[PDB]
Amino acid sequence: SMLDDAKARLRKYDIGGKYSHLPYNKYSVLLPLVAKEGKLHLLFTVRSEKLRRAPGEVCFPGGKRDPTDMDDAATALREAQEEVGLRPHQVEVVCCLVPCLIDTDTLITPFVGLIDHNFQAQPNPAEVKDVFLVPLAYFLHPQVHDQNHIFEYTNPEDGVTYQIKGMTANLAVLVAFIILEKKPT
Ligand SMILES: *CC(=O)NC1(c2ccc3c(c2)OCCO3)CCCC1
């Protein structure tokens, strides 16, 4: 199946807990895969302007680990629930991808999760100004604009254009390569 295939691909890139104990300022993000109209999509947020970290940016759901979190995956899930209403039972965490080192003292750990088809986003306006989907295939042939490289994605449902950049754009490309490379049509 499309989903069994995607999960099988993703598991080959799982680093698991290999980097999880290192003494960093720790953040997790959830890369949420959603199947619609027979294709995979990634779910993104636009962060509220009110935030301290990345205000107004296109980001995956996520945030800073807190003492309650059993592990780095729990961080991702807690933060996704708080931001977009995603409950734990609505997500299957498939793997942990390469972590992203920033600012010399920070480690961001990305988790890919498959999202239940009955999930409907409920954007929390204190955290998120918008929640949107991009087809995963877009990241193989993106519309690039140079400021460094920025992707522009125009939702054909409404004509709205989103700018995706930095680590968020880099992860979206990685996931697209992992899942979509070398497939029969
Ligand atoms: C867009 C994005 O990834 N936002 C998050 C983020 C985490 C950590 C840092 C930054 C953004 O910005 C600068 C360095 O630290 C928000 C919370 C999870 C990811």
Domain definitions of the chain by residue range: 1-185
Which residue do the tokens 């929390």 mark?
124
| One-letter amino acid for residue 151 of the chain | F
The C-alpha atoms of residue 83 and residue 81 are separated, in whole angstroms, by 6
DSSP state at residue 49: T
Cα dihedral 138/176/64/20 (nearest 10): -170
Cα dihedral 182/73/48/158 (nearest 10): 30
- In this structure, is the dihedral angle defined by the CA atoms of residues 155, 145, 139 and 34, taken in order, positive or negative? negative
Residue 29: count of CB within 10 angstroms of its CB: 25
Q: What are the structure tokens assigned to 125, written together?
A: 């306006």
Cβ of 174 below 6 Å from ligand 1 = no
The C-alpha atoms of residue 138 and residue 143 are separated, in whole angstroms, by 8
What residues have CB less than 8 Å from 135, skipping those under 6 apart?
39, 40, 41
The C-alpha atoms of residue 184 and residue 94 are separated, in whole angstroms, by 23
Q: Is 105 left (phi over 0), alpha (psi -120 to 50) or beta?
A: alpha
Cβ of 127 below 6 Å from ligand 1 = no
Instruction: Kindly give the distance from the C-alpha atom of residue 154 to the centroid of ligand 1, in angstroms, as a whole number.
Output: 23
| Probe target for ligand 1 pocket from 57, 97, 108, with the most ligand atoms within 8 Å of CB | 108
Three-point CA angle 52, 154, 78, nearest 5°:
40
Cβ of 103 below 6 Å from ligand 1 = yes
Cβ of 163 below 6 Å from ligand 1 = no
Three-point CA angle 158, 161, 164, nearest 5°:
135
User: Atom 2 of ligand 1 has which residue's CA nearest to it?
Assistant: 59
